[PDB]
Design a protein around this ligand. Structure first.
Ligand SMILES: Cc1cc2nc3c(=O)[nH]c(=O)nc-3n(C[C@H](O)[C@H](O)[C@H](O)COP(=O)(O)OP(=O)(O)OC[C@H]3O[C@@H](n4cnc5c(N)ncnc54)[C@H](O)[C@@H]3O)c2cc1C
Ligand SMILES: NC(=O)c1ccc[n+]([C@@H]2O[C@H](COP(=O)([O-])OP(=O)(O)OC[C@H]3O[C@@H](n4cnc5c(N)ncnc54)[C@H](OP(=O)(O)O)[C@@H]3O)[C@@H](O)[C@H]2O)c1
Length: 435
């Protein structure tokens, strides 16, 4: 293997990593500048449910970045370093028969390699499994390959070797049993009970736990010391009778701004600058298209435009094309948006309720029905913004704008594609999409 295990049975607490991503004790002793290697532990001052229904859980969080010296603008992204569910970590230690509180270091057998450890060391297995390792996504075939040797029941070792192989049936089994069934490492250990790998080897095989990004839902002109997040919690039942939970969203959902014994809920974070930005001149009109959580950056945009108007500045038309399933189920920021509309901050609030009728009604349907005014605004130099689903929504919306320009612009499709692409090059058509 790549690393050798060195158990530290009597190490000083001050020398042990407890979840920090960079320098030892950086989470506890916070000093600017804060960035990816030195994230700021922001206190969660607000964590509230946005949706009216109970089908899903959509939440709004406000992270206190006071005294961090962190600067951000609406449109930027905030990254958070999450922690795995403690109950899941406990189950892994139990099924493996391992003492999770053992502190150790995994050191590269190649003493010349720049990669001295697989994650911050020395640290305990509990800490590694909680903050440094991905224990929820389906293990890659290579992991299964190395794990097979530790399954003492021949049939189980055979199963693991088969799914890790390049055989025809092996690939289909891996696809169905691991990937599609969304079996995480614990699920595999439970379903192949003879599998008993040493915990240190497992820690060398698993991928690192990654930061998750969110579109900041606040304007720094209004909340210079707070970064807001709008997110939908990931939680689903698998085809293997299990309930899988998204790591970052369930971790955030559990962040209690209070917590007995006091204790403020802290979220390690940093800001990643984007090119998604409101027009330099407040008088320039904006067309925002963001269904679902895609409305996130636009809550900040509108907050900013409203603030500017409140200051006494002249602000151009500000239009929002939002969408949700049902008005009384998942209409995010319904109250806030209604107020922005009533006060004049939001010139138009066009909402597509996709499941309030037998057929689908999406934002692009509303865009097309507003083709005349949108063309006028576009010809006038308006900026278009699209945020949300990159799979279908973004493409469907782009095609709708193609058609609008093609029709109202009295030009051929190709000429319309060129027209829109020139808007993108000139920074007048921006996208912030994800899968
Ligand atoms: C630039 C950028 C900006 C973003 N902004 C936002 C934002 O503002 N708001 C927001 O809510 N999210 C946003 N996201 C998505 C966000 O980063 C996370 O991916 C999301 O919150 C889920 O993370 P998680 O850790 O909870 O889920 P994870 O633990 O990472 O799990 C997610 C994975 O679970 C699987 N999955 C989910 N549902 C099912 C199902 N029914 N069946 C089978 N597998 C399933 C998929 O493989 C999915 O990729 C953004 C992403 C990017 C790249
Ligand atoms: O947050 P979230 O990600 O979980 O969002 P989401 O609830 O999955 O979706 C947000 C909104 O986008 C709609 N939608 C789905 N596919 C779309 C498409 N191709 N074009 C335009 N709108 C679409 C949804 O309708 P449906 O879910 O009813 O299709 C819903 O009203």
């Amino acid at each position: 293997r790549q690393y050798e295990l060195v158990v530290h049975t009597d190490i000083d607490a001050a020398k042990v990593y407890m979840g920090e991503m960079g320098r030892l004790k950086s989470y506890e002793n916070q000093k600017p500048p804060f960035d990816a290697k030195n994230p700021f532990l922001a206190a969660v001052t607000t964590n509230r449910k946005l949706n009216q229904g109970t089908e899903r859980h959509l939440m709004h969080l406000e992270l206190d970045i006071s005294d961090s010296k962190i600067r951000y603008e609406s449109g930027d992204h905030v990254a958070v370093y999450p922690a795995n569910d403690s109950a899941l970590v406990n189950q892994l230690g139990k099924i493996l028969g391992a003492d999770l509180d053992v502190v150790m270091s995994l050191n590269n057998l190649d003493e010349e390699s720049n990669k001295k450890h697989p994650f911050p060391c020395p640290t305990s297995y509990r800490t590694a499994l909680t903050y440094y390792l991905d224990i929820t996504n389906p293990p890659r075939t290579n992991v299964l390959y190395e794990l097979a040797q530790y399954a003492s029941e021949p049939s189980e070792q055979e199963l693991l070797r088969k799914m890790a192989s390049s055989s025809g049936e092996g690939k289909e089994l891996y696809l169905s049993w691991v990937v599609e069934a969304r079996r995480h490492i614990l699920a595999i250990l439970q379903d192949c009970p003879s599998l008993r790998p040493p915990i240190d080897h497992l820690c060398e095989l698993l991928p690192r736990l990654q930061a998750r990004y969110y579109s900041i839902a606040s304007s720094s002109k209004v909340h210079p010391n707070s970064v807001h997040i709008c997110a939908v919690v990931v939680e689903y039942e698998t085809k293997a009778g299990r309930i899988n939970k998204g790591v970052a969203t369930n971790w955030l959902r559990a962040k209690e701004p209070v917590g007995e014994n006091g204790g403020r809920a802290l979220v390690p974070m940093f800001v990643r600058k984007s090119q998604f930005r409101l027009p330099f001149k407040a008088t320039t009109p904006v067309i925002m298209v963001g269904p679902g959580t895609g409305v996130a950056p636009f809550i900040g945009f509108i907050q900013e435009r409203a603030w500017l108007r409140q200051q006494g500045k002249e602000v151009g038309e500000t239009l929002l094309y939002y969408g949700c399933r049902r008005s009384d189920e998942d209409y995010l920021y319904r109250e806030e948006l209604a107020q922005f509309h009533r006060d004049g901050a939001l010139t138009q609030l066009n909402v597509a309720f996709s499941r309030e009728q037998s057929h689908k009604v999406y934002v692009q349907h509303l865009l097309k029905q507003d083709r005349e005014h949108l063309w006028k605004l576009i010809e006038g130099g308006a900026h278009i913004y699209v945020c949300g689903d990159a799979r279908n929504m973004a493409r469907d919306v782009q095609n709708t704008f193609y058609d609008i320009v093609a029709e109202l612009g009295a030009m051929e499709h190709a000429q319309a594609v060129d027209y829109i692409k020139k808007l993108m090059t000139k920074g007048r058509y921006s996208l912030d999409v994800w899968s």
